[PDB]
């Protein structure tokens, strides 16, 4: 096959410690006994509960109704009874309204779930209706609704669909297992998305450290001449939806105009697999993959776990704590969010749990700038982080805006390479927040 | 009451050299000794007094369209008379300050004071203002000249201090040796103004 | 049409604007010339007095002086092959009871650090330099202005037969050797060139 | 009832291994062989001077950082680098107080009056040398370089070239290795030891090839266009020390790749302008110091292009 290559300019080379869980087989979680389902598992308008305390629910039964257009429903992961419709701690640090369900032991399927159909019988309107009804959001991390993404406005033109298989953050190997095991579902989901949008071109981009996944995808594609696979060089910011576009297609997204103005539609391999599975079976989104790894975990592994299970249950299922942890992170080490407690349930965009020990979580105090200039070299947007940080640190928002601080993608790289151990990306975030806020109180 | 305040604004409160930063060419040019600064200050004081009194005497007939040509004529006349007298009786001071004695007419502090305090006040306030500004200029120039001369020559007022084998810092009597010193002095004053 | 016919009276104030200025200017002149009438000549006297002192200190004795008509000076400058003209200013002859005494020559040599200096040299009857002095200079006060100090006193004693050579060393070697000032070498060469031109003038004249 | 007491912060949660102190220690390691050659050639007084300078620098910094109520960050090994580089710019016949005065001027005035490390716009070790040369010209010119045991040299190689006496100059191999009668500054006589240690900083990634290559190419071209020897002009004087170690200062050089090419061309042109038609035998220090002033003007015209911002033309605010 014609496997082409591509790369971009800038970036860094982290240690890439993925070797620990790559050769370990795939594990399956046990049956849960209690689930907490929040009312906001996406971005947009939160849902409204339609269940009461003491009610009896099925598996796959809707417990939340969308409010506006950018809103997806919420379903139940187990079969049991409702014990609380109060608010519980969330991954953002503050309590969010949720529904608590206690499991019964049996998984009784709702008596209204049937297969939607076949690829040749569905067409675009029914495909979009099925995607909306199953509550599928973006599994890449942003959790943007999919049915909004597949509804192209009439004043825009697109001609290709690109799947993001370039999983680049360290410690994470869920997409590797998904591509190695379920390539046929990924191809079927790509075909379904291509038919829904109405294009005749499709690309898949996989990094070169997953050659077995590339071979599996090439074998699964078959004799179709409209599908292509690209082998990409191993770099950290490679998969951030923009450098992927530059490497595969060669185009550049304009200054604040979204990828839809470049003529492409970017999706994830997990979303495509979920679309194919929901078409074949008829069940909603209630289960995904996770990677439980780190320095304070006895037996790290990749495990398939339902939605609503607390973090502590996963940690207990993966051995436990070998030592006292000093940091718990939801996601990767480069863009994850540190937690306060371990009562947090897993969500639709939770791709890993990373526990660090006390010695490995220590960073020295920031010092003076020495004007080395490495942060300028490593930036993929070709900005100058030192000037923006120094202007933000003394409350000069006009100079921050004049230095093009609103097109930073917050990728971490600039703060990783600093010899003086500074916090450049945090200052850039502060400047961006203030610039955005000043546009509403002055207009 | 109104006479002592104008006289005593002068040195401390509104020093032209340390607080207004005006007239910086003679200050950095001639202050290589403790004698040149005093003579320059006295000449500038005489010119300032004469020009201020003359301009304040005639603040009713000069229109606002020919003001600066009317001012510079009086200032240049006083400067020329003072220069003729100095060349007649003090040739050494004229030779030591050769170019900047014709240049007293443009000193950045005479025209500014004439515009500010001479075209809107009486005859008695302008005299006190001129006396105070001249005293402040003379004191600042003398201090800077003594400080530079002690380090760059090893003597004060022509009297040696460090012996006949001292090797001076020959940068303090150079153009780059002025700027830095003055800056440090100003900084010190600012510190003692803001921490007290 | 004068920007839409400015209304008459705009000219009437014009005669008011000039006249006062005119008066002021006249008054200024009415001062300055008077001061000049009291001052200028006196200044001239002082100048010549200094020059007289400059002529008397270099050749210390009780004698009279006579001035060359300044066309013989130009003839000497034309002869002997003096490659740059108008660098010789004044030549005077001393007289002490009939017999000749010496000569006093003023010259402005170029190629200094900051332009032209003025050097005066006095020579006796037999060739001996009895002292030199600096009349005008515009060099650095702490670096090139030291020529009018103890550096001049070493110029006495040198015979008027050959030229002089400047050396960069503490040791003075022997005859016709001049030790320059540390950190100041161009001024010493300029003064030596002026002395050499004066001594060439003396050699050409005294034969 | 056991709590956890975790740590909360912002991304990223991992960092690199290099820091500020490692860079300066690597600079000292690179500068060691020149110190060895200087100690072998000039004797035991060539080392002691260096020590004096180092001590003074460190002491000065500590005192200031005690008086202004600031953390004493003397363990970043920056004042040691400044002291060593200043001590490499001295003759062998210098008194002990010259190094102390130079170190005090370099640390107190140039560096600490503008904020501290990385916040000045000028080179401290070259400005201190320029101040010392102007203040005390007798202790630094043409005679302090020759040792007292040698009485037949009387001139350094760069002073025998401006007078046309190129028949009494040392050989080109002796000017390159630095032995057999080559005199000058204590840490400049060997171009073989300043290139071995200069190629070690390129391999570790501290400096790049751009400034060292373009500084040396312009000197060779200029000496070729006027009919002189390209090699004698590169292995004599303070050019190899300035190209690899002093023109590559972090706080005085441009940060982009296009400005570091324009900067080096000017640094190489002003050197040979002063060398051939000037009042000094060598003009490396002032050529480097004059390009530290024009650096903020080069940086505003040599910026790069932001991703996605292609526009049409340079309309800007018109």
């Amino acid at each position: 096959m014609n496997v082409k290559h591509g790369t971009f300019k800038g970036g860094i080379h982290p240690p890439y410690r993925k070797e620990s869980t790559a050769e370990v087989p795939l594990g399956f979680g046990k049956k849960p006994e209690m689930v907490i389902i929040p009312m906001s598992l996406h971005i947009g308008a939160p849902c409204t509960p339609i269940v009461k305390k003491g009610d009896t629910v099925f598996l796959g039964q809707r417990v939340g109704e969308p409010n506006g257009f950018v809103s997806v429903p919420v379903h139940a992961s187990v079969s049991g009874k409702v014990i609380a419709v109060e608010e519980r701690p969330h991954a953002s640090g503050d309590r969010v309204m949720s529904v608590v369900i206690e499991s019964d032991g049996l998984d009784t399927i709702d008596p209204s779930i049937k297969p939607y159909g076949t690829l040749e019988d569905m067409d675009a309107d029914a495909i979009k209706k099925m995607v909306l009804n199953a509550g599928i959001v973006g599994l890449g991390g942003a959790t943007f609704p999919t049915h909004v993404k597949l509804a192209i406005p009439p004043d825009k033109k697109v001609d290709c669909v690109v799947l993001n298989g370039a999983e680049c953050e360290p410690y994470l190997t869920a997409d590797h297992h998904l591509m190695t095991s379920q390539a046929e579902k990924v191809v079927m989901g790509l075909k379904l998305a291509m038919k829904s949008v109405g294009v005749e071109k499709g690309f898949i981009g996989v990094e070169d450290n997953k050659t077995d996944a590339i071979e599996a995808l090439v074998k699964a594609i078959g004799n179709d001449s409209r599908l292509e696979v690209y082998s990409l060089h191993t770099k950290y910011p490679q998969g951030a939806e923009k450098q992927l576009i530059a490497a595969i297609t060669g185009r550049e997204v304009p200054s604040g105009a979204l990828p839809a103005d470049a003529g492409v539609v970017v999706m994830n391999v997990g979303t495509a697999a979920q679309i194919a599975e929901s078409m074949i079976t008829g069940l909603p989104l209630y289960k995904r993959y996770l990677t439980c790894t780190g320095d304070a975990i006895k037996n790290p592994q990749t495990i398939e776990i339902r939605i609503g299970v607390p973090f502590q249950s996963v940690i207990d299922q993966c051995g436990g704590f070998s030592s006292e942890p000093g940091k718990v992170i939801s996601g990767g080490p480069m863009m994850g969010v540190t937690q306060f407690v371990t009562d947090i349930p897993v969500m639709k965009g939770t791709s890993g749990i990373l526990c660090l020990t006390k010695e490995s979580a220590k960073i020295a105090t920031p010092s003076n700038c020495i004007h080395c200039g490495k942060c300028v070299g490593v930036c993929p947007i070709h900005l100058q982080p030192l000037n923006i940080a120094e202007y933000s640190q003394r409350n000069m928002w006009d100079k921050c805006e004049s230095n093009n601080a609103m097109d930073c993608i917050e990728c971490g790289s600039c703060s990783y390479i600093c010899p003086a151990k500074r916090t450049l990306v945090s200052s850039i975030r502060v400047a961006k927040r203030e610039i955005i806020a000043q546009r509403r109180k002055g207009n | 009451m109104n006479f002592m305040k104008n006289l005593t604004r002068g040195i401390i409160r509104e020093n032209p050299t340390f607080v207004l930063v005006l007239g910086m060419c003679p200050t950095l040019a001639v202050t290589t000794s403790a004698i040149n600064g005093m003579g320059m200050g006295l000449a500038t004081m005489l010119v300032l007094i004469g020009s201020n009194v003359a301009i304040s005497a005639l603040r009713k007939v000069i229109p606002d369209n020919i003001r600066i040509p009317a001012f510079v004529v009086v200032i240049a006349s006083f400067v020329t008379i003072v220069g003729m007298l100095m060349k007649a009786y003090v040739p050494a001071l004229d030779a030591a300050l050769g170019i900047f004695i014709p240049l007293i007419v443009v000193n950045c502090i005479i025209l500014a004071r004439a515009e500010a305090f001479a075209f809107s006040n009486g005859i008695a306030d302008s005299f006190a203002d001129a006396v105070g500004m001249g005293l402040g200029f003379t004191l600042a120039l003398t201090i800077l000249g003594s400080i530079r001369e002690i380090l760059g020559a090893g003597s004060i007022f022509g009297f040696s201090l460090f012996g006949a084998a001292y090797e001076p810092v020959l940068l303090m009597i150079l153009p780059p040796g002025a700027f830095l010193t003055l800056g440090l002095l100003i900084g010190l004053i600012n510190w003692k103004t803001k921490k007290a | 049409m004068e920007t839409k016919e400015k209304v008459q009276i705009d000219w009437k104030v014009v005669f008011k604007l000039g006249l006062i200025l005119f008066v002021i200017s006249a008054v200024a002149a009415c001062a300055l010339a008077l001061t000049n009438y009291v001052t200028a000549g006196t200044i001239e006297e002082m100048n010549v007095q200094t020059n007289t002192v400059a002529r008397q200190e270099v050749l210390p004795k009780a004698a009279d002086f006579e001035a060359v008509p300044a066309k013989d000076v130009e003839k000497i400058a034309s002869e002997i092959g003096m490659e740059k003209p108008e660098e010789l200013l004044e030549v005077y002859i001393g007289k002490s009871n009939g017999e000749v005494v010496g000569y006093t020559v003023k010259t402005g040599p170029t190629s200094g650090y900051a332009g032209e200096v003025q050097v005066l040299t006095g020579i006796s009857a037999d060739g001996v330099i009895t002292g030199i002095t600096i009349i005008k200079s515009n060099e650095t006060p702490g670096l090139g202005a030291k020529a009018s100090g103890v550096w001049n006193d070493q110029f006495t004693g040198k015979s008027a037969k050959e030229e002089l050579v400047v050396v960069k060393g503490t040791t003075k070697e022997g005859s016709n050797e001049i030790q320059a000032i540390t950190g100041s070498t161009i001024t010493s060469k300029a003064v030596t060139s002026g002395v050499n031109m004066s001594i060439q003038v003396y050699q050409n004249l005294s034969k | 009832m056991n709590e956890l007491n975790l740590t909360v912060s912002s991304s990223p949660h991992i960092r690199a291994k290099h820091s500020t102190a490692s860079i300066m220690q690597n600079v000292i390691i690179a500068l060691l062989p020149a110190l060895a050659v200087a100690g072998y050639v000039f004797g035991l007084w060539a080392l002691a001077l260096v020590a004096i300078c180092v001590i003074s620098s460190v002491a000065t910094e500590a005192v200031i950082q005690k008086l202004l109520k600031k953390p004493i960050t003397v363990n970043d090994w920056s004042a040691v680098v400044t002291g060593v580089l200043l001590a490499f710019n001295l003759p062998i016949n210098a008194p002990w107080w010259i190094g102390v005065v130079g170190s005090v001027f370099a640390i107190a005035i140039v560096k600490q009056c503008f904020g501290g490390l990385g916040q000045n716009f000028i080179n401290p070790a070259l400005a201190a040398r320029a101040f010392l040369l102007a203040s005390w010209p007798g202790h630094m010119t043409s005679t302090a370089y020759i040792p007292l045991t040698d009485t037949v040299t009387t001139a350094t190689p760069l002073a025998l070239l401006k007078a046309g006496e190129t028949g009494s100059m040392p050989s080109t191999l002796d000017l390159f290795t630095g032995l057999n009668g080559v005199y000058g500054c204590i840490g400049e006589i060997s171009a073989l030891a300043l290139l071995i240690g200069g190629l070690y900083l390129i391999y570790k990634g501290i400096i790049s090839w751009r400034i060292p290559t373009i500084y040396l190419l312009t000197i060779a071209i200029f000496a070729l266009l006027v009919g002189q020897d390209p090699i004698v002009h590169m292995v004599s004087g303070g050019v190899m020390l300035g190209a690899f170690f002093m023109a590559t200062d972090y706080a005085s050089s441009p940060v982009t790749a296009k400005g570091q090419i324009i900067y080096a061309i000017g640094c190489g042109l002003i050197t040979m302008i002063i060398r051939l038609y000037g009042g000094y035998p060598e003009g490396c220090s002032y050529s480097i110091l004059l390009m530290n002033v024009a650096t903020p003007l080069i940086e505003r015209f040599t910026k790069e292009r932001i991703y996605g911002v292609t526009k049409i033309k340079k309309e800007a605010k018109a």
Partner: protein, 191 residues
Amino acid sequence: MTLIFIMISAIFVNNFVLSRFLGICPFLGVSKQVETAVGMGVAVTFVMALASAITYVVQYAILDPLSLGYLQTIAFILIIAALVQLVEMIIKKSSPSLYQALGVYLPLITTNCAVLGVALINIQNEYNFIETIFNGVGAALGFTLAIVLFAGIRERLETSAVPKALEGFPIALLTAGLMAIAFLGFSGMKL
């Protein structure tokens, strides 16, 4: 060839601001930004270039063959003031009104010690017409270059952290001293 050497010596070897201590008050006053520095340099260039020829003509046509040499300063300053008045009249009308942020330094273009200084230097050096024009243009270009470099440095300084007490004028004077050393590098050149 002599005109080129005169221009070069006026711009580099004998810069008016750093060496001769003439244009210092606008140097510290106006150099907080680049655009104002460029505008002030252009205005100063125009004023000097127009004043030099008029001063030459007035001195050598009237004062010399009349024995009235003591009226040099008053006539020269009258001519310069009358020129700067017209410059002030033309600048504020058509050139942007926001440029009147000099704040006293615009009527100090009359004062501006470099202008009368270069006029007296041209008079005392016994030049010709074209030599005076070239000297005036060279002095103006040197002033413009110095003020542009200062305005460029001060923004990098605004990035840095002066402690609390130096701030405006002391750090400007220290920067000027360091630039004066860097230009003391340009010395001893025979042109």
